[PDB]
Amino acid sequence: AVTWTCLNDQKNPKTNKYETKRLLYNQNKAESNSHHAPLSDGKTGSSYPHWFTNGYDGDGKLPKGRTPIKFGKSDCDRPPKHSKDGNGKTDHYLLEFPTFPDGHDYKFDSKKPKENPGPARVIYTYPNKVFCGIIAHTKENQGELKLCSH
Question: What are the catalytic residues?
């Protein structure tokens, strides 16, 4: 359906240089992976799906240098009322699952061991899970998560 593509900088060990590769993700897989994982902030093996601060602190306000990934939604931009385990009575926090391009459902339940996650991640509310988009770290898997574009 939709093709969420991101541009992450990979430090190729062969060339010891940073290259900007195009990480194409299939929304169908993101909206699917997210429709497989349980809706609970840090309550699984790999912890995932973990609450996505989205720049927020866990209430609605943002720390020093407010940079909340703007998806273009009112609920995705809404204050993510993240509780203890982000699982109250009707918690509406923005979760961030590590979505894969292959379209597999990474073992997010596998605590130990637990292979390294992915750069591009799926973002979606709860329990609505109104798939907002995919975001990836323009610098490998750490740099500011730039909302991929389809």
Answer: 50, 96 (proton acceptor), 137 (proton donor)
In b/e form, how buried is each residue of 88-120, taking b as 16+ CB within 10 angstroms? eeebbbbbbbbbbbeeebbebeeeeeeeebbbb
Is 137 assigned a catalytic role? yes
Is the separation of the CB atoms in 134 and 148 below 8 Å? Answer: yes
Residue among 2, 15, 1 at smallest CA distance from 148: 2
Residue found by looking up tokens 């995932």 in the block: 48
Q: Into how many domains does the chain fold?
A: 1
CA distance 135 to 39: 19
CATH code: domain of residue 8:
3.10.450.30
Q: Which domain holds residue 36?
A: 1-150
- Please tell me the distance from the alpha carbon of residue 136 to that of residue 122, in angstroms, as a whole number: 9
Whether the Cβ atoms of residue 110 and residue 46 lie closer than 8 Å to each other = yes
Q: Which of 82, 104, 137, 144 is catalytic?
A: 137
What residues are paired with 147 via a beta bridge?
135
Method: NMR
Q: Is 92 a catalytic residue?
A: no
Instruction: Pick the catalytic residue from 19, 31, 35, 50.
Output: 50
